[PDB]
Amino acid sequence: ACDYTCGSNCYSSSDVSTAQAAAYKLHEDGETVGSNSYPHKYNNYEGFDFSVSSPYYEWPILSSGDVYSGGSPGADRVVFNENNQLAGVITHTGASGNNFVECT
Ligand SMILES: Nc1nc2c(ncn2[C@@H]2O[C@H](CO)[C@@H](O)[C@H]2OP(=O)(O)O)c(=O)[nH]1
Ligand SMILES: [Ca+2]
Fold this sequence. Notes:
Blueprint lengths: L3 E3 L2 E3 L1 H17 L10 E3 L13 E5 L15 E6 L4 E6 L9 E2 L2
Antiparallel strand pairs: 1-2, 3-4, 4-5, 5-6, 6-7
Calcium ion (CA) binds next to loops.
């Protein structure tokens, strides 16, 4: 079973922790990856009720199992905060335009 299901993509907690760890390191060092400059701030326009406090940052989580290193980010993202706490896992899949819905 999946801990997080984003459309057809299935993720486990370990997939999320690995992705998040790489993103937080880049965040602490002030470095970015890709044309969209990940990780970058997630404004939470959707108004998701996260358990952890703002500010939030987003990083792509890939169905391939590899950690993002540039190129297409896919539709899935891991959202984390300043204290490296997982806020949630979201996706463009099943959401209109460039909006987001939570992964179940
Ligand atoms: N829908 C949405 N997009 C956001 C938010 N914060 C940042 N973005 C980014 O804003 C732009 C327009 O939606 C996109 O670059 C999207 O990023 P990603 O595609 O990199 O996730 C947010 O809270 N909601
Ligand atoms: Ca996996």
